[PDB]
């Protein structure tokens, strides 16, 4: 039983819901595209725009083999302004511990409840973040344990959906304030989510 693939499936499905919800809560796109759905027993807002949905799906589909092999340190949702400068970053840090004492007592059920706590926190995170002007677009960054240039073949899973090394401008924020949102530990996955916010005066 390949638990690396189980962890990758669970994380890709979760990250897809989280990306949709971040875009809604931080007003990256007009509210009119979103529809309330149920994920992790929790009411989430998901885009109904087909091209946006396909971009997000394709992005996470490509990340899945890197997750399966435990080659991902963090997945980051970068919100960008009209000049493609980072406004805000949602950083999902990930480690997959030794998969050895894995519980037989409804493991995935316990994991889904820990992941639900992330979705719920994102849904109210406007209450703990600053209220700067919203961005108008975004990207997803995949930080790997090994040099990124050597995961290029592994990540390019989808025809005509190429990946590239990010520019420092896509990544760097000046002395950002780090706002922790949620942390979780489990037998198969440890993860923490925090936000990089613009620095204050």
């Amino acid at each position: 039983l390949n638990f690396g693939q189980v962890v990758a499936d669970v994380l890709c499905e979760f990250l897809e819901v989280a990306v949709h919800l971040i875009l809604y809560v931080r007003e990256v796109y007009p509210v009119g595209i979103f529809q309330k759905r149920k994920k992790y027993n929790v009411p989430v807002q998901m885009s109904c725009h087909p091209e946006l949905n396909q971009y997000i799906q394709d992005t996470l589909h490509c990340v899945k083999p890197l997750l399966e092999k435990n080659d991902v340190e963090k997945v980051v949702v970068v919100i960008l302004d009209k000049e493609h400068r980072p406004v805000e970053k949602f950083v999902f840090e990930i480690t997959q511990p030794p998969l050895l004492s894995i519980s037989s007592d409804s493991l995935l059920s316990h994991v889904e409840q820990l992941l639900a706590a992330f979705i719920l926190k994102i849904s109210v995170c406007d209450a703990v973040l600053d209220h700067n002007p919203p961005g108008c677009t975004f990207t997803v960054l995949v930080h790997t344990r090994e040099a990124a240039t050597r995961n290029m073949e592994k990540i390019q899973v989808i025809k005509d959906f190429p990946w590239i090394l990010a520019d420092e401008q896509d990544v760097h924020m000046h002395d950002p304030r780090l706002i922790p949102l949620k942390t979780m530990t489990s037998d198969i996955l440890k993860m923490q989510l925090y936000v990089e916010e613009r620095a204050h005066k």
């Binding site: 997803v140 790997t144 290029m152 990946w163």
Partner: protein, 36 residues
């Protein structure tokens, strides 16, 4: 608060080459009316 993986300029990440779509308020109105 200390992250597990602090910023490291010597290890750039990968990102999609393609950009997510541009969605005007009017396009969003069509999404709302027809696809929700």
């Amino acid at each position: 608060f200390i992250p597990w993986f602090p910023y490291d300029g010597s290890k750039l990440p990968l990102r999609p080459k393609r950009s997510p779509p541009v969605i005007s308020e009017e396009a969003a109105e069509d999404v709302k009316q027809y696809l929700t």
